[PDB]
Amino acid sequence: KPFTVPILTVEEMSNSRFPIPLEKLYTGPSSAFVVQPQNGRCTTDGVLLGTTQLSAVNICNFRGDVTRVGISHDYTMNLVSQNWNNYDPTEEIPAPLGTPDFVGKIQGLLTQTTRADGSTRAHKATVSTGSVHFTPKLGSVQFTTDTNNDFQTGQNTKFTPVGVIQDGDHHQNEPQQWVLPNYSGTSGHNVHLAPAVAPTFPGEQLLFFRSTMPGCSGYPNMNLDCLLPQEWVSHFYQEAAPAQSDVALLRFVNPDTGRVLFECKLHKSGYITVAHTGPYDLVIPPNGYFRFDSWVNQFYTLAPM
Amino acid sequence: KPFTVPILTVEEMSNSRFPIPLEKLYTGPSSAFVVQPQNGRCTTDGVLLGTTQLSAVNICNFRGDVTRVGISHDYTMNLVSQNWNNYDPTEEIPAPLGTPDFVGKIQGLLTQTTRADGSTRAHKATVSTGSVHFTPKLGSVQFTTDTNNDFQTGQNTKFTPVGVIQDGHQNEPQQWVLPNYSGTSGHNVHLAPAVAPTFPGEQLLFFRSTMPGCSGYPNMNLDCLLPQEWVSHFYQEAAPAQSDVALLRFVNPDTGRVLFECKLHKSGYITVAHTGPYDLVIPPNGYFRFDSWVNQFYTLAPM
Ligand SMILES: C[C@@H]1O[C@@H](O[C@@H]2[C@@H](O[C@H]3O[C@H](CO)[C@H](O)[C@H](O)[C@H]3O)[C@@H](O)[C@@H](CO)O[C@@H]2O)[C@@H](O)[C@H](O)[C@@H]1O
Ligand SMILES: C[C@@H]1O[C@@H](O[C@@H]2[C@@H](O[C@H]3O[C@H](CO)[C@H](O)[C@H](O)[C@H]3O)[C@@H](O)[C@@H](CO)O[C@@H]2O)[C@@H](O)[C@H](O)[C@@H]1O
């Protein structure tokens, strides 16, 4: 089965690490980080990795029942699955599919319906994924909310993420997009992780699909880079085209002129490298798209960006 | 190019009318009312219709600058596009792509960044699409928010939708009543067509989600004609339609057994042979498979 990537333009696609559109292509140095995201991870032959699932609308969402922590404005959510069935901690994944894969304070609305009478409610809420109470692998996370009394026990509750917050004099100190949470808190180390990725070939860097997360309070670092658009994850999962070598050579083309703007290496394990050093917002026509041209190896020397 | 539909299961897909996952399949009568959604509209050969665009995460989102209405808690948003560029009201679409296509009060967060210093803010906010101030085709909508002073002028502002509210039970939203995209100033234009079965014994098949409820007693059902992933698939594939009707079989790969068959009409909606309201019962790995081009007079096996 011939391998292909989607023909959608960058801005027609979705970030695979938060439910927001892509904005641009970005390359930068990654030696200062361990780049090990768990969402947006999929092999070119369609094997999902980490905590990756198939739709952007589920990323960083949570569902379950809630109970108030003491007499505070915090609530513990006992997680269930996307379709409201019981969560299974025994599954060989790091955490429920779609769980946030960075340390940060994600703000959104926590909503609830009372089944018996159809009454509903919503409150602004934040989940701090660096908190010791962020234990999604164990089946629970904690939210700080704007209420201490309105949520009912035993009722279906959903968190819909919107953006991120920051607090402190050191501006843009959080979120930390390349620091994984401890999915089981202090109780144990992370398990079943998709591997870290790094360029190995001289002169190469990762290519990122970049968005700006909405900021909700303070001075957050709003950059969010994913390794694959969500639509590529879905495409590979469905097509399941066999990888005929370790690397798929892609050309980024202007469809109007037919000219190649740059070329890159899509590694079969699901990430892209380009030949560039330093931070660079790629200059591209908005109708540009990626095209698979041939199967190559990890030592293929790209035309420099 | 051979026509195909995605192999994703229902719960792996997204509603094309609000940024939430699909939950289930429903069929029912719809003779007594107009079915004319504007999001989730695409022909099988990839022509987008109505206000349909390509990703679910953009649906019912709004962007622009805001100005306070008087000294109230309401703010007017002067709309821009998904990437902060111009919206052209003269483009022959009903309203900006992704605009809500139902009358209801949508609640979410209105967020803002101050360009100069990177300070940010968020407030609970509702857009009433039945309001006279819901005029997206004119380039503006109005939000009621939980602040009367925190939003700044001339700064990028985004509404992220979460769910719906009600006042008065389940009388709103009205998912099949289109808002007036130009308010009282003009009638709706450039709409994707209304849809109905034409063959006796058939009903529409709906891809159903439940919108989160945020206050009161809202009607939370939300039915779309095509999953968002089908819109994106057809747009990219652009496979020619060999007839006006594609026969799909819904298959359980666990058994190879066909659960039911249905007609995917070229103009982008599905019918089944059934009379009455019915919540379909489907296996977890079930999916749709295109088998052949037929015609409007093909009789489906009863669903
Ligand atoms: C930088 C600052 O971020 C946000 O303000 C927060 C404060 O937020 C609280 O009050 C503000 C209005 O002053 C607003 O009503 C917000 O909803 C509410 O949570 C507060 O958290 C303090 C604590 O030190 O930090 C910031 O000042 C934002 O509202 C401001 O516009 C501004 O961007
Ligand atoms: C049916 C009812 O809907 C929601 O309540 C609203 C009220 O909402 C206001 O106060 C409530 C707490 O009582 C909550 O703090 C909410 O955020 C706030 O807007 C209010 O709008 C009244 C006015 O008619 O209608 C409802 O009572 C929800 O909060 C309740 O839990 C309940 O489901």
UniProtKB/TrEMBL annotation, chain A:
Main location group: host cell
Localization, UniProt: Host cytoplasm; Virion
Superkingdom of origin: Viruses
One Gene Ontology cellular component annotation held by this UniProt entry: virion component
Domain Calicivirus coat protein C-terminal: 81-305
Keyword Amino-acid biosynthesis attached: no
Protein name as catalogued: VP1
